[PDB]
Scaffold this active site. Structure first.
Site, short mmCIF file in Angstrom:
data_model
loop_
_atom_site.label_atom_id
_atom_site.label_comp_id
_atom_site.label_asym_id
_atom_site.label_seq_id
_atom_site.Cartn_x
_atom_site.Cartn_y
_atom_site.Cartn_z
N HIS A 1 0.80 -1.21 0.00
CA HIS A 1 0.00 0.00 0.00
C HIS A 1 0.83 1.27 0.00
CE1 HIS A 1 -2.77 -3.01 1.83
NE2 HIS A 1 -3.71 -2.38 1.13
N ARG B 1 -3.21 -3.12 28.09
CA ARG B 1 -3.79 -3.58 29.35
C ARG B 1 -3.47 -2.54 30.42
NH1 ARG B 1 -6.44 -4.39 33.40
NH2 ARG B 1 -6.53 -6.31 34.63
N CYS C 1 -0.23 -11.19 28.16
CA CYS C 1 -0.94 -11.03 29.45
C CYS C 1 -1.28 -12.37 30.04
CB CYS C 1 -2.19 -10.19 29.15
SG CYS C 1 -3.16 -9.85 30.62
C1 HEM Z 1 -8.63 2.97 1.37
C2 HEM Z 1 -7.53 2.32 1.79
C3 HEM Z 1 -7.02 1.12 0.94
C4 HEM Z 1 -6.75 1.07 -0.36
C5 HEM Z 1 -6.89 2.18 -1.42
C6 HEM Z 1 -6.30 -0.28 -0.65
C7 HEM Z 1 -5.93 -0.75 -1.89
C8 HEM Z 1 -5.36 -1.98 -2.16
C9 HEM Z 1 -4.81 -2.40 -3.44
C10 HEM Z 1 -4.76 -1.50 -4.70
C11 HEM Z 1 -4.37 -3.65 -3.29
C12 HEM Z 1 -3.65 -4.57 -4.32
C13 HEM Z 1 -2.12 -4.32 -4.29
C14 HEM Z 1 -1.27 -5.00 -5.33
O1 HEM Z 1 -0.84 -6.15 -5.06
O2 HEM Z 1 -1.02 -4.38 -6.39
C15 HEM Z 1 -4.64 -4.05 -1.92
C16 HEM Z 1 -4.35 -5.29 -1.37
C17 HEM Z 1 -4.56 -5.70 -0.07
N1 HEM Z 1 -5.02 -4.84 0.92
FE1 HEM Z 1 -5.65 -2.93 0.72
N2 HEM Z 1 -6.28 -1.04 0.52
C18 HEM Z 1 -6.73 -0.18 1.51
C19 HEM Z 1 -6.84 -0.53 2.83
C20 HEM Z 1 -6.50 -1.74 3.39
C21 HEM Z 1 -6.52 -2.06 4.81
C22 HEM Z 1 -6.90 -1.04 5.91
C23 HEM Z 1 -6.14 -3.33 4.95
C24 HEM Z 1 -5.96 -4.19 6.21
C25 HEM Z 1 -6.53 -3.88 7.37
C26 HEM Z 1 -5.88 -3.85 3.62
C27 HEM Z 1 -5.47 -5.13 3.30
C28 HEM Z 1 -5.08 -5.62 2.06
C29 HEM Z 1 -4.68 -6.98 1.77
C30 HEM Z 1 -4.65 -8.08 2.85
C31 HEM Z 1 -4.36 -7.04 0.46
C32 HEM Z 1 -3.86 -8.24 -0.34
C33 HEM Z 1 -4.46 -8.95 -1.52
C34 HEM Z 1 -5.68 -9.81 -1.32
O3 HEM Z 1 -6.61 -9.21 -0.71
O4 HEM Z 1 -5.69 -11.00 -1.73
N3 HEM Z 1 -6.10 -2.87 2.68
N4 HEM Z 1 -5.26 -3.01 -1.26
N1 LIG Z 2 2.16 0.79 35.72
C1 LIG Z 2 1.42 -0.19 35.17
N2 LIG Z 2 2.12 -1.16 34.48
C2 LIG Z 2 1.63 -2.26 33.87
C3 LIG Z 2 0.05 -2.41 34.01
C4 LIG Z 2 -0.63 -1.34 34.78
O1 LIG Z 2 -1.92 -1.47 34.89
N3 LIG Z 2 0.10 -0.31 35.33
N4 LIG Z 2 -0.59 -3.60 33.35
C5 LIG Z 2 0.39 -4.84 33.26
C6 LIG Z 2 -0.14 -5.96 32.62
S1 LIG Z 2 -1.09 -6.91 33.58
C7 LIG Z 2 0.24 -6.17 31.23
S2 LIG Z 2 -0.47 -7.62 30.53
C8 LIG Z 2 1.20 -5.17 30.42
C9 LIG Z 2 0.56 -4.81 29.23
O2 LIG Z 2 1.37 -3.90 28.48
P1 LIG Z 2 0.94 -3.22 27.36
O3 LIG Z 2 -0.16 -2.49 27.65
O4 LIG Z 2 1.95 -2.29 26.83
O5 LIG Z 2 0.54 -4.27 26.32
O6 LIG Z 2 1.52 -4.01 31.23
C10 LIG Z 2 1.84 -4.38 32.60
N5 LIG Z 2 2.38 -3.18 33.14
MO LIG Z 3 -1.60 -8.81 32.23
#
Ligand code: HEM
Ligand SMILES: Nc1nc2c(c(=O)[nH]1)N[C@H]1C(S)=C(S)[C@@H](COP(=O)(O)O)O[C@H]1N2
Ligand SMILES: [Mo]
Ligand code: HEM
Ligand SMILES: Nc1nc2c(c(=O)[nH]1)N[C@H]1C(S)=C(S)[C@@H](COP(=O)(O)O)O[C@H]1N2
Ligand SMILES: [Mo]
Lengths: 463, 458
Positions: A63, A135, A182
């Site tokens: 992307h 957490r 956790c």
């Molecule tokens: C508006 C925002 C986005 C646009 C314009 C966009 C566009 C695209 C495009 C053009 C491709 C094909 C790329 C290539 O191989 O040429 C692609 C693939 C992919 N994108 Fe996005 N994307 C967007 C947001 C996201 C987000 C937020 C995620 C994940 C949370 C995501 C996951 C994926 C995945 C997993 C593929 C892989 C191919 C497949 O689906 O088999 N995309 N996207």
């Molecule tokens: N000072 C402070 N440290 C802490 C905690 C908290 O509540 N206060 N949560 C603990 C627990 S139980 C976990 S599982 C991890 C989680 O860290 P993270 O939030 O960055 O994933 O912080 C640990 N350190």
């Molecule tokens: Mo935790």
């Protein structure tokens, strides 16, 4: 010519009827009409609704290429404006808590506790900071950088008062890649057996980052403590977050782990190459590799050495494992040890429960990890509820013996037949050949911690 | 006055027809007629038939009392007399007849399961024995231990030098064979390996020089960049000359906390021949295979031991692997072992009396991880009770010895029980419910819950 919007206002557009808006850099995009054009379907892209594309761009770097960015620009509808950051406790104790990405699966808002969508967990070795599980037991501390001081004391060492600047210049900076899990990860599977007390985590209360900071060893030696102390000594930690009564979050680790060079315990000020986010402990947190997340104290305020374990509630009256026969009326926290190293664990992140997958080939993916630096030597994957198994491919680089602090991502591509039902199971084996148990009942406990029985995911194959 | 007999002769008298003979000190007793008068029944006393009472006297110190020694003296019938490639085993040492032998040549055997958890330290005579080859006959005075490797001064230590140059250290450690409980694996599907029951595990107080101290003495450093190993070679060899061998990572060999010893004493006496006389390596918290007996050489190397048993044996595989697909390059050598536990009392198929029943067993985990809890079930794993852990606490990370456990529970006349145990270690590792999912072609790493069915006298 482009209307400006706050991150908050953008967060109101999380659905088709509402309009799906996302951000990238300082641009705001309305991608409602694009969701149906997205390669691979809408399931993943809709995870970004109302928030930044940044973390997802880190997972899927394609992307970042010019052709994808040129496509995204077709949907631009505005620009972001700096977010004002205001006057604590007037509105409420959690009023000053930092904003979070809307894609997180939140199980508690006050105090804030959330995990990233499971399908994204094993998509990248390092979990993006915006998706790293969070957490918090209490409100997040608001810390002014220049006046922050880390206090270090205890019997056998003077009394230091280190500013963030001193922490950074006095001690050599080390980086350690470590997975934080956790104690309640996968607690939801415990509840299926019998109701338990605690946050209803799914398989995402675990995340991985490259931590950067001072070695705890180096800071304690600078304070004047010896490399070794006869008998059982502990290093106690206290955070800046406290309850109304005044007791701060606290925990401790054995003195031996704190002083060992190979144990890699850090007083981290950086996370995945940037300053520690507020939710993850800004400005400083303890990072204890191979040990339950509870001991990695965030917003660190004090480090002390003591002959005894931390007397904090969370060290003494929580985070312990008990026989499945123990109930609230008989539980006695004096009878079990505080959880330090965690047992071998693993989960399936792809496909997800209830999915209907196309026939032909299916790629099953997940994570595996073991405490105490013990590497994952194998992951077995079943498609028939655990009757027969296949060995998965382990991804990533090996680590030095006893220092496998980071999870192993795994994958296995297998043929699946149209119109069948699958019960996908994974189980891992560590370097001490410890294994995961078949079922949850025998490991059940009233707090639902230590949930490491095989992860089972039911899916169907389309025709 | 008294005829003299060898131990071999006495070993031929273990039943009423041949007469039941036992020894104590240098005396031989015909206790055939006393078996019916032994308090508690004939079961226990007959375990010693044809052999020494010594080990059993150690399990039950009540026998050290004046009246017991005196009661025995009236049954004396005699006194004990001391003492090629067609039979490569002709020089092996005599063993106690009470052992449960699974192989005679090479000698492999385990103590009766009912005695295993009857004492924290297992008497030397009953300590399980695993020999891949004939036992070396070693002359103490001429024995030399070779130590060598890159960056270290070659050493040639006599026994006397091993005792005097290095401060003696004592470590109580449990040795567990990789095949312990293999029979539970065989139940599911036949495997390759000795048919051990639950007794391929025993515990002793070992005494010797720290491996760390010997290596440092030769000039080896506390740490080496990258993955280095310490390789061991025993004096036992196959007909072609290849010696038994194994290795452990260099980090463990040099660690002060790991307690690895070059042991020359076992439970207060010199090392028995079957247990490595005059010197064996004892690697606490690690599979028995790595504790090389009859040690002849210690070598520092950048690579793991090339021995057959380090490379092409003692590894765990997926349950899907079969002989046509097994590839030893795909798994790591077993070093630390996983959490384990077993019921030693009652024994499978027993018919226990109504009222109270004391269930006992052992529990252990590798890598110095202590056992923090043992759950016991009487209804096949449906409901569980917590057992009492016996023994003394060890320093964190250094729990090398097993924890003996027990639990007394009320049993109803005419009932059927399925007794199950499972243990939890200090990293909160747990044992798996069933054997199929951990099965492997060699039947090693058998740690699924131990299940023992018994009935209560109606
Ligand atoms: C508006 C925002 C986005 C646009 C314009 C966009 C566009 C695209 C495009 C053009 C491709 C094909 C790329 C290539 O191989 O040429 C692609 C693939 C992919 N994108 Fe996005 N994307 C967007 C947001 C996201 C987000 C937020 C995620 C994940 C949370 C995501 C996951 C994926 C995945 C997993 C593929 C892989 C191919 C497949 O689906 O088999 N995309 N996207
Ligand atoms: N000072 C402070 N440290 C802490 C905690 C908290 O509540 N206060 N949560 C603990 C627990 S139980 C976990 S599982 C991890 C989680 O860290 P993270 O939030 O960055 O994933 O912080 C640990 N350190
Ligand atoms: Mo935790
Ligand atoms: C000739 C050899 C032996 C003699 C003369 C002998 C004699 C005795 C005597 C006199 C007692 C009762 C002590 C008391 O007053 O409390 C006793 C108890 C006992 N002996 Fe032996 N014994 C012999 C061999 C053995 C052996 C080899 C074993 C073990 C395998 C054994 C196991 C026991 C046990 C378990 C008890 C206690 C009984 C109970 O639990 O009720 N004995 N024996
Ligand atoms: N030299 C030598 N050392 C050896 C062996 C061997 O056959 N030769 N057997 C190994 C195995 S597999 C085990 S389980 C232990 C058993 O030790 P023990 O007989 O004293 O109980 O010795 C180990 N050390
Ligand atoms: Mo063994």
């Amino acid at each position: 010519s482009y209307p400006e919007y706050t991150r908050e206002e953008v967060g109101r557009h999380r659905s088709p009827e509402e309009r799906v808006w996302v951000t990238h850099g300082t641009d705001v995009f309305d991608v409602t009409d694009f969701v149906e054009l997205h390669p691979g379907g809408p399931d993943k892209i809709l995870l970004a609704a109302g928030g930044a594309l940044e973390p997802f761009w880190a997972l899927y770097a394609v992307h970042g290429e010019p052709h994808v960015l040129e496509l995204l620009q077709q949907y631009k509808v505005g620009e972001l404006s700096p977010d004002e950051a205001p006057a604590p406790d007037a509105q409420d104790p959690f009023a000053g808590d930092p904003p979070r990405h809307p894609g997180l699966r939140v199980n508690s808002q006050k105090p804030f506790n959330a995990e990233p969508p499971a399908e994204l967990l094993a998509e990248r070795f390092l979990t993006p900071n915006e998706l790293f599980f969070t957490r918090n037991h209490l409100p997040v501390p608001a810390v002014e950088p220049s006046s922050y001081r880390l206090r270090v004391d205890g019997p056998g060492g003077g009394t230091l008062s280190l500013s963030l600047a001193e922490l950074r210049s006095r001690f050599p900076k080390h980086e350690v890649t470590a997975t934080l899990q956790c104690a309640g990860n996968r607690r939801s599977e415990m509840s299926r057996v019998r109701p338990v007390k605690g946050l209803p985590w799914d398989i995402g209360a675990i995340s991985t980052a490259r931590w950067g900071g001072a070695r705890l060893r180096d800071v304690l030696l600078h304070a004047g403590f010896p490399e070794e102390l006869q008998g059982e000594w502990h290093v106690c930690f206290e955070g800046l977050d406290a309850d109304p009564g005044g007791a701060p979050y606290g925990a401790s680790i054995p003195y031996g782990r704190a002083l060992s060079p190979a144990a890699d315990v850090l007083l981290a000020y950086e996370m995945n190459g940037t300053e520690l986010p507020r939710d993850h402990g800004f400005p400083v947190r303890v990072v204890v590799p191979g040990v339950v997340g509870a001991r990695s104290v965030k917003w660190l305020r004090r480090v002390a050495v003591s002959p005894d374990e931390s007397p904090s509630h969370w060290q003494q009256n929580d985070y312990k494992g008990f026989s499945p026969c123990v109930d609230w009326d008989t539980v006695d926290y004096r009878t079990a040890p505080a959880i330090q190293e965690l047992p071998v664990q693993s989960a399936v992140t792809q496909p997800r429960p209830g999915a209907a997958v196309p026939p032909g080939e299916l790629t099953v993916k997940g994570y595996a990890w073991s405490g105490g630096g013990r590497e994952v030597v194998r992951v077995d994957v079943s498609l028939d509820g655990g009757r027969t198994w296949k060995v998965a491919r382990l991804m990533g680089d090996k680590a030095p013996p006893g220092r496998a602090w980071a999870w192993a991502l795994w994958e296995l591509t297998v043929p699946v037949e149209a119109g069948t039902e699958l019960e996908i199971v994974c189980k891992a084996v560590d370097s001490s050949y410890n294994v995961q148990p078949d079922s949850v009942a025998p490991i059940w406990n009233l707090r639902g911690v230590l949930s490491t029985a095989w992860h089972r995911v039911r899916v169907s194959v389309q025709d």
